[PDB]
Amino acid sequence: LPVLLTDLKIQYTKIFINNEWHDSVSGKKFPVFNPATEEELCQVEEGDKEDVDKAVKAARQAFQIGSPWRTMDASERGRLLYKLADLIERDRLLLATMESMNGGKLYSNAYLNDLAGCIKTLRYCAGWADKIQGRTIPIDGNFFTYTRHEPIGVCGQIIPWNFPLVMLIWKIGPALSCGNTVVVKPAEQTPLTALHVASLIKEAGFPPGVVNIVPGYGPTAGAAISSHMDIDKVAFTGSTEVGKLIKEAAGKSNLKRVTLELGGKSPCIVLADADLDNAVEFAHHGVFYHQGQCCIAASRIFVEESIYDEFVRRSVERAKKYILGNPLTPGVTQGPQIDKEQYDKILDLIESGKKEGAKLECGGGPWGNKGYFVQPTVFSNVTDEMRIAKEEIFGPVQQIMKFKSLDDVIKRANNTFYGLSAGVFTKDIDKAITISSALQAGTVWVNCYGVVSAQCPFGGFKMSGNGRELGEYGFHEYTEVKTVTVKISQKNS
Amino acid sequence: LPVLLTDLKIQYTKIFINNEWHDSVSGKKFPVFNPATEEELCQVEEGDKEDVDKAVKAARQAFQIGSPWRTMDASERGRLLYKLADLIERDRLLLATMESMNGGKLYSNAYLNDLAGCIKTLRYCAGWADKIQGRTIPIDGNFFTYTRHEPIGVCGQIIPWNFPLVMLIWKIGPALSCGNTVVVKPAEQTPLTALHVASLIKEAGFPPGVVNIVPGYGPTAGAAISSHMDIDKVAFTGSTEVGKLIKEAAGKSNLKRVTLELGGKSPCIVLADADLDNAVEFAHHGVFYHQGQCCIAASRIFVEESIYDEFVRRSVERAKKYILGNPLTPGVTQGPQIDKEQYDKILDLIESGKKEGAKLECGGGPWGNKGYFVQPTVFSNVTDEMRIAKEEIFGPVQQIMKFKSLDDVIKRANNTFYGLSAGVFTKDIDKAITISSALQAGTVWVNCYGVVSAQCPFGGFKMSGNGRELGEYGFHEYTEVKTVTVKISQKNS
Amino acid sequence: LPVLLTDLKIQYTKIFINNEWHDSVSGKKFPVFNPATEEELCQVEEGDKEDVDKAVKAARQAFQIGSPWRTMDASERGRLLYKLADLIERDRLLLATMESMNGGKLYSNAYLNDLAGCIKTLRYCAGWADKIQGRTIPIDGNFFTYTRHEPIGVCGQIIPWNFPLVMLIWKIGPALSCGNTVVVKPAEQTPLTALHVASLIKEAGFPPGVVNIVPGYGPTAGAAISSHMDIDKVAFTGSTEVGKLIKEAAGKSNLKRVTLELGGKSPCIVLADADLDNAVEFAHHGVFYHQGQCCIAASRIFVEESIYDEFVRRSVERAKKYILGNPLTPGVTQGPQIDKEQYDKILDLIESGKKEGAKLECGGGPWGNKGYFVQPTVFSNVTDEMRIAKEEIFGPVQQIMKFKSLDDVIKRANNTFYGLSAGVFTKDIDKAITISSALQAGTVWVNCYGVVSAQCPFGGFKMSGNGRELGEYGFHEYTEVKTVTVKISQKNS
Amino acid sequence: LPVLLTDLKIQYTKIFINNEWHDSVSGKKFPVFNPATEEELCQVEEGDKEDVDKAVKAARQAFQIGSPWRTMDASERGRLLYKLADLIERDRLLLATMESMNGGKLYSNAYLNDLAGCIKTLRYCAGWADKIQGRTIPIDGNFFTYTRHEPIGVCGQIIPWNFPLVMLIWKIGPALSCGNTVVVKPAEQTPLTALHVASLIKEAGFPPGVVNIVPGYGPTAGAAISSHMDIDKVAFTGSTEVGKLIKEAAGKSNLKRVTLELGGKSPCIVLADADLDNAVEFAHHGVFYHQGQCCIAASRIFVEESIYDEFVRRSVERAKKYILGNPLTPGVTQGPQIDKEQYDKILDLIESGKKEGAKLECGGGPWGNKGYFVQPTVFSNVTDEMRIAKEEIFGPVQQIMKFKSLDDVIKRANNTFYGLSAGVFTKDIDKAITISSALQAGTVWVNCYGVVSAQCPFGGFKMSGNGRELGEYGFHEYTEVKTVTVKISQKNS
Ligand SMILES: NC(=O)c1ccc[n+]([C@@H]2O[C@H](COP(=O)([O-])OP(=O)(O)OC[C@H]3O[C@@H](n4cnc5c(N)ncnc54)[C@H](O)[C@@H]3O)[C@@H](O)[C@H]2O)c1
């Protein structure tokens, strides 16, 4: 069971460059807030273009040929990553409590799901460190040809606020495993866990300048990271508008490599032959997980007509059993929304759903005076023209849509520009294989949902992002291929 | 549709060495018979130890460093294989007719299933020719390490009689693609198609000595191939007893590499939720294909109790629709057995099945005065202790067994020393995945049977054989890994 | 030897959509000229936004689920590619002559290097067609996870004029092999060979709409291809400025995948221990190949000080043996420049080199009143600040630079924003590996130059492009990964 | 620096079955001796056929479907291997001292070379644990086909005495990583370190029965392991005669998979252009490492004629600087031989070399009254017909042979039935590549020797073994491929 949380004292609130702690060049500090109580946790140094510039200088120096990080053995890189994972596991309680407090997330989920995933991903990347290999090629003519997979260079990574630690680890695992150096920009809502992890990275024994962390504001620091000319690759997780902005900024400077992890409107199809209890439980989990603040949240629940009513009824009942309170309080299953802006956005989208004429089963309003709490909400009879069926709500709002024919529901689920995930619930094998082949989603789950692991590559199809993460194919993205061809006297098979 | 067969004239009946035709040293020639009418086709030169030694000398000389075959480009090897496949496709009619006459197999099956499979396998291997690659390894220390996949050397291959052309192609495809040279020994029952293919190989433009064919008797020629010290690898397809002898002989001399493909008592499980018509059709196809002369033939049809009777009834009716006659005759679907020894063995096994007390539904006796025809036969109420449930009949005899609980049938199907194949018929995803995981078979088929393609690796568990064929893993077997490590001044990631 | 060229009649001058020939919507036709004689070959239909839109509609319809191209077997795609390659080999003479006339390239080089490379690349892609595979993943929990590599969708490809057929094949090989559909835009200078290949594609038996070709002007047709919302991927080969524009336009529209091939200022290092004759011959070949109109042309010839003088002298002698004349004339080694704009650009760059104070050893002016011919040119004592040492000349101009220290020359060669290729000439084993590791180029040659093959991946590092082509890693670029995870009752190792 | 050794107390001297310590069924115990002083260390239980049978029963029960080891996650297997490696690193001193005492090996080499290699190999295998993957195959027809790589089953491993811990780890790393269960038979000379590691394995938390260790005599316990029918695979490291016997015995029983790691007569070619000091140092190291008791020991030192004499002189001087004494004593560079039988065999081979007429430079006789020490020995003018040039001496005896032509020395080095290793010393890239391609050895070193790491596969070519170890290809050997093909309604690319 999770261990009781203790007093939280925050000491790391600065810019982490060259294994040192620097104040911002301008000298400005922005506050950070607690969603559960609307209180300032602390102040954090505000990074801008100068800080990003000096961080990139430090990383570029650390990436030079002959530097301690470039001549280091790959097995040693894996060893360093394992030591970092062990250090994280040592401080599991403090990191979980900081994640819960800062990001307004349930302590049990911030302990048994977040840090476990972080540790597993770190250890997986550490295992992959010394096992990615080039090739030897049977080229025509008297030649000996091979290909090496080298680190790309300097990678600038932009983290979202919904999973600070998990996304941070997913960004700095494959990057450090392949040998790159990173300058990371955490979200302005949740910058603390990344700074503590930076202190742990310094303790672990990474060479100075390998990992640098600049906390600031996205429009200034993130733009500087994306428009920098000395940065070789940029990885970004967030909204599609900022994703387009990042892509265009990269197109305007240095033609750097770009990896995007944008959002999506994930459908969850339930067929007449599916197990009803499992389907209900996993649909509720898919839409209501982490207060609905997930990129892969099942927002459009397609349910076959013959079992529609019953499903809806049970769904309603489940939404009533959800309890809403302070994250650190035991027994709660839903915490507050991240900040006031998303809170007001969710309220506006719920009101728009009511205005467009969608049946309201449970919820549909705010909860509590202090904090940002929204009641679990269910919208039935959602048509394809409603805004709640098109725009990513990113909140605890569930839509239940009806269908009769399989081809029609396939065309409906593929009728979007979001291709991040999909879910199919059925007992048949032919239906499962056919639907999983037909759907245009980066990940298709069958009889389950929200199942992510470090091994399986993850990404979006159409506009949910470019590239994949968490896998051998994910590790492919952080390396550059160099081909060497040597003229030899004579070749033999 | 298949094109009408023509007159057959057989010219190639000698030993094929160094792209030449040699009489055997002993001067002895053994006849070859036609199963349909019991007539001598022609006399074929009888290979022996001296002929095998001569062929091995030729192949070893053709494998020397700097020889035309060793300096040849891999793409050129693929080009030669494609030319061989086009030449085979040019002579599809003559090869199909020769296969039908020699092996006693239906002309339609010899044309639409054998030649097509040979062509597809040859083209697949030709594609693989120049795409197998070594690796570059991140070894510790200031070293640069890579690995090359080289041809093993001389490979002696022993072919069965049930699929002469198909097995010959499966042997000389991966071997020639990886650059090896082959000395093959065809079955004494069906030597002619391999000799015609040898003539085609000479026409295609392979360097002399790359492919050598020695037709003879297994105890003399096959043993000489297996006991030879110059031969580097031996591949053998045939019975388990001869395979045991081959493995022991290889252990005695030269410690050569051994690949064994042996038979098996393949189960075929049909569950209550399976589609009855498809299950009946594919079980009938699986047991009765090629007069049951297949290594993967479904010999133990486990059928769930609640649907037992009905299934049996339908099965019986299907076995009555089988027509037995001359292979070249249109409209026939079953030909004669390969030779009289197997014919009498099948009759003895049927009589023993009758004696042990298994219900006889259809067949159980010979057909026709001239030929080696056995009526299609069905045995019901087959228990685990019966000999027909333990010994590979290799004839058109079908056993139907009853079960109730899934775990019991799993233990029954795994209670054997054969692991070649299996088959599951069901409409449920969970049952399909569970059974396919829990079965100890090299290939598991769900809702189908007898589906073999050049892309998927093929092999057996337990005593069914060692190694795999027809795939990247199959191409792994015909290569040897050489690791080269070079001391360098300094290494960088 | 190359067969004698014959008369040329050009019938294919329209837009190729849905295996049909359409006039442009506007109705305008632009002429195409012959560099050797400055004569109009014929008028070609001028494609614009409407033509691109209807071609993309046709391709999208051809890519629909259940269409003939999507249900077709991968082996059948390989078969179609092989048939296309055979059809090309049948019309080798006409295609070589058309390439020589349109692109102003030597007939011997067109017949022996362009057509052979196209055929080899097509056959290599056809082999790769049915051998790219997903994976099965040992995910945690009672789950079964696999990954499929599907075609991306519609791919718009933009071809340069220096290697029309070769680049066209390098584009439509990996795209059709993975199952995608293509809308290609040929260069306005050389559109004819692509149209003839389109007619051959129709003859081969590809389904309608799989391949579409729109000839036009880049600022109108290429921009419409790069900004189209429906198009899934864009591949572009050309100048860095247009590539920057393509990247920005893709960032503005639906965030399509982008592959870029851009030029570079490739260095060629010659050390004191290198074989002088081979180094001289291959440096001359590297810089002067195809009138210097190559992306990988060795523009900066670094030569060690102690062997500088002699090398230069020998180089001068070689440049005097180069003969300049009409491409179809036998015995010529250099043809005309592609068009007047590049011709004047080359003359201006030569004059600027003269002005900045580089020693002129041979050439430096035009040859011939009729045509676009520039004498082979040699510039010695080139310093790092001269424009001829920074700006890609794309003409028969050679720069010879001097160095003394290995580290300094490494820094000089890496002191650029181009990373396309590099060349090292030495007899040592430590120097070769050290320099090949230390150079920031996408392809490093040792003791050779200009060695390209379908097997080895090809691409640029910093601003020479993104991604790779011609290889397994190249085939990785044209596929999208879909992860399917199924909840199972129980998993076993 | 190595830490000072302490008092050694040995408590583990029994048979390790089902995470328990059992006395032998017979009740007999054989002593174990210390080579340095010829003293009994302790008595170890003597395993025979009954003990092997019950160990195989325990392992087979542990391998059953649904058992804790089979349902365990692959990441958990890697975690267990990492915990075992950490436990070994905790007891580095005791294990190093036990290895030094039992095997008569230098304490500094036992600490800085054996324990480090064991830890690195264990961590490498633990990383590989959850990263080996099946495939999904584009099979023809409306089918979905994939392949899983399952554990083979029960593996019986036979360890030599030269590197007890290192070979034990090389055996139980890939076996446990792929999920198999092991019954291991250690050498009768050095059984103690394996027993201590077994106790550590029990402490780490492996399920009972996963690892079982039976110490005994090779002719009885090893034969029982190799002839057992319930055993699925056998891996054996040792002499070629016993390997031949193992292969034949396996061919007589249940056709189990066989992996052999036999000996070799490794050449070491030194060319005129090689660095003399590095060549001398690494040749001396290669021949004299671990008292010459290595499978890859460079026994035939081919040196080019023009630099022969000088090399020999320097070699002689190096052999005089070797110091012979007790292993635990600091400063010593050579310990005693393993036991008296090998000691007398080495003396007999030295005497035979003297008799056949080979010039004796240094050594050639015994050293010390108590112990099994042999003086470092150098034999010059060794011809191809001498027994010292053919038979693996396995002792500190060095042969120096002369050559003049590269082709002749290539033929000489390939004129043998051993193919384990080779070494080339040169400063030329063309010579290095040519010789490394031409040599028939499983591992070719350039300008170095005796460089082994967990990443690079290791094995012999002709009669030095069958298979590879320590790498992805090495991990291929411990898995079986199962192909699953499912009939689907319709397939799409
Ligand atoms: N492969 C090459 O030909 C190549 C490689 C590197 C450098 N270059 C440079 O290219 C110069 C010649 O310029 P060029 O444009 O005639 O050849 P190019 O190779 O740059 O051709 C660019 C391609 O993109 C198209 N295009 C043009 N403008 C476009 C636009 N605004 N948007 C989208 N597509 C557009 C063109 O039709 C052509 O197919 C040479 O002087 C050389 O320096 C060419």
PDB file of C-alpha atoms in Angstrom, chain C residues 21-101:
ATOM      1  CA  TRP C  21      -3.760  11.451 -70.093  1.00  0.00           C
ATOM      2  CA  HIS C  22      -5.472  14.757 -69.290  1.00  0.00           C
ATOM      3  CA  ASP C  23      -4.910  18.252 -70.584  1.00  0.00           C
ATOM      4  CA  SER C  24      -4.337  20.933 -67.976  1.00  0.00           C
ATOM      5  CA  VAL C  25      -7.395  22.683 -66.562  1.00  0.00           C
ATOM      6  CA  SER C  26      -6.077  26.103 -67.588  1.00  0.00           C
ATOM      7  CA  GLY C  27      -4.979  24.827 -70.997  1.00  0.00           C
ATOM      8  CA  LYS C  28      -1.463  26.297 -70.995  1.00  0.00           C
ATOM      9  CA  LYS C  29       1.567  24.341 -72.210  1.00  0.00           C
ATOM     10  CA  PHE C  30       5.152  25.236 -71.507  1.00  0.00           C
ATOM     11  CA  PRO C  31       7.997  24.261 -73.868  1.00  0.00           C
ATOM     12  CA  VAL C  32      11.025  22.155 -72.984  1.00  0.00           C
ATOM     13  CA  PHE C  33      14.484  22.853 -74.394  1.00  0.00           C
ATOM     14  CA  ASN C  34      17.588  20.901 -75.375  1.00  0.00           C
ATOM     15  CA  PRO C  35      20.714  22.141 -73.542  1.00  0.00           C
ATOM     16  CA  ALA C  36      23.126  20.935 -76.235  1.00  0.00           C
ATOM     17  CA  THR C  37      21.605  22.910 -79.119  1.00  0.00           C
ATOM     18  CA  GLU C  38      19.099  25.268 -77.418  1.00  0.00           C
ATOM     19  CA  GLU C  39      16.068  23.908 -79.260  1.00  0.00           C
ATOM     20  CA  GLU C  40      12.525  23.231 -78.108  1.00  0.00           C
ATOM     21  CA  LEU C  41      11.817  19.526 -77.718  1.00  0.00           C
ATOM     22  CA  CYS C  42       8.034  19.769 -77.290  1.00  0.00           C
ATOM     23  CA  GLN C  43       5.296  21.434 -75.250  1.00  0.00           C
ATOM     24  CA  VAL C  44       4.255  19.849 -71.946  1.00  0.00           C
ATOM     25  CA  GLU C  45       0.957  20.481 -70.172  1.00  0.00           C
ATOM     26  CA  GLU C  46       1.279  22.977 -67.323  1.00  0.00           C
ATOM     27  CA  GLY C  47      -0.054  21.629 -64.028  1.00  0.00           C
ATOM     28  CA  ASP C  48      -1.464  23.903 -61.334  1.00  0.00           C
ATOM     29  CA  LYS C  49      -3.553  23.694 -58.164  1.00  0.00           C
ATOM     30  CA  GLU C  50      -6.650  22.183 -59.803  1.00  0.00           C
ATOM     31  CA  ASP C  51      -4.636  19.406 -61.455  1.00  0.00           C
ATOM     32  CA  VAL C  52      -2.867  18.616 -58.178  1.00  0.00           C
ATOM     33  CA  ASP C  53      -6.217  18.572 -56.376  1.00  0.00           C
ATOM     34  CA  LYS C  54      -7.800  16.109 -58.793  1.00  0.00           C
ATOM     35  CA  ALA C  55      -4.682  13.912 -58.769  1.00  0.00           C
ATOM     36  CA  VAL C  56      -4.805  13.826 -54.966  1.00  0.00           C
ATOM     37  CA  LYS C  57      -8.497  12.923 -55.160  1.00  0.00           C
ATOM     38  CA  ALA C  58      -7.670  10.037 -57.497  1.00  0.00           C
ATOM     39  CA  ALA C  59      -4.852   8.801 -55.257  1.00  0.00           C
ATOM     40  CA  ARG C  60      -6.987   9.047 -52.114  1.00  0.00           C
ATOM     41  CA  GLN C  61      -9.735   7.037 -53.796  1.00  0.00           C
ATOM     42  CA  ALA C  62      -7.164   4.436 -54.850  1.00  0.00           C
ATOM     43  CA  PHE C  63      -5.927   4.229 -51.239  1.00  0.00           C
ATOM     44  CA  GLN C  64      -9.357   3.466 -49.731  1.00  0.00           C
ATOM     45  CA  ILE C  65      -9.862   0.364 -47.597  1.00  0.00           C
ATOM     46  CA  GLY C  66     -11.005  -2.537 -49.756  1.00  0.00           C
ATOM     47  CA  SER C  67      -9.629  -1.030 -52.959  1.00  0.00           C
ATOM     48  CA  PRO C  68      -7.684  -3.317 -55.324  1.00  0.00           C
ATOM     49  CA  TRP C  69      -4.355  -1.771 -54.301  1.00  0.00           C
ATOM     50  CA  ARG C  70      -5.012  -2.196 -50.564  1.00  0.00           C
ATOM     51  CA  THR C  71      -6.192  -5.818 -50.618  1.00  0.00           C
ATOM     52  CA  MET C  72      -3.427  -6.778 -53.064  1.00  0.00           C
ATOM     53  CA  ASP C  73      -0.739  -9.080 -51.687  1.00  0.00           C
ATOM     54  CA  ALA C  74       2.686  -7.632 -50.939  1.00  0.00           C
ATOM     55  CA  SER C  75       4.283 -10.289 -53.143  1.00  0.00           C
ATOM     56  CA  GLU C  76       2.017  -9.019 -55.918  1.00  0.00           C
ATOM     57  CA  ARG C  77       3.308  -5.478 -55.368  1.00  0.00           C
ATOM     58  CA  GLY C  78       6.835  -6.822 -55.718  1.00  0.00           C
ATOM     59  CA  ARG C  79       5.760  -8.672 -58.857  1.00  0.00           C
ATOM     60  CA  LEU C  80       4.347  -5.458 -60.333  1.00  0.00           C
ATOM     61  CA  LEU C  81       7.568  -3.604 -59.537  1.00  0.00           C
ATOM     62  CA  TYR C  82       9.613  -6.350 -61.209  1.00  0.00           C
ATOM     63  CA  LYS C  83       7.388  -6.176 -64.281  1.00  0.00           C
ATOM     64  CA  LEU C  84       7.907  -2.406 -64.388  1.00  0.00           C
ATOM     65  CA  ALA C  85      11.672  -2.923 -64.165  1.00  0.00           C
ATOM     66  CA  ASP C  86      11.553  -5.450 -67.014  1.00  0.00           C
ATOM     67  CA  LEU C  87       9.504  -3.037 -69.130  1.00  0.00           C
ATOM     68  CA  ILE C  88      12.063  -0.306 -68.432  1.00  0.00           C
ATOM     69  CA  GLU C  89      14.901  -2.634 -69.433  1.00  0.00           C
ATOM     70  CA  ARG C  90      13.015  -3.325 -72.663  1.00  0.00           C
ATOM     71  CA  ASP C  91      12.986   0.405 -73.518  1.00  0.00           C
ATOM     72  CA  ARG C  92      16.508   1.137 -72.247  1.00  0.00           C
ATOM     73  CA  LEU C  93      17.626   2.780 -75.495  1.00  0.00           C
ATOM     74  CA  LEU C  94      14.697   5.174 -75.859  1.00  0.00           C
ATOM     75  CA  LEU C  95      14.809   6.212 -72.200  1.00  0.00           C
ATOM     76  CA  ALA C  96      18.583   6.730 -72.298  1.00  0.00           C
ATOM     77  CA  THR C  97      18.323   8.843 -75.450  1.00  0.00           C
ATOM     78  CA  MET C  98      15.479  10.906 -73.985  1.00  0.00           C
ATOM     79  CA  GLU C  99      17.509  11.474 -70.815  1.00  0.00           C
ATOM     80  CA  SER C 100      20.523  12.538 -72.887  1.00  0.00           C
ATOM     81  CA  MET C 101      18.510  14.986 -74.994  1.00  0.00           C
TER      82      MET C 101
END
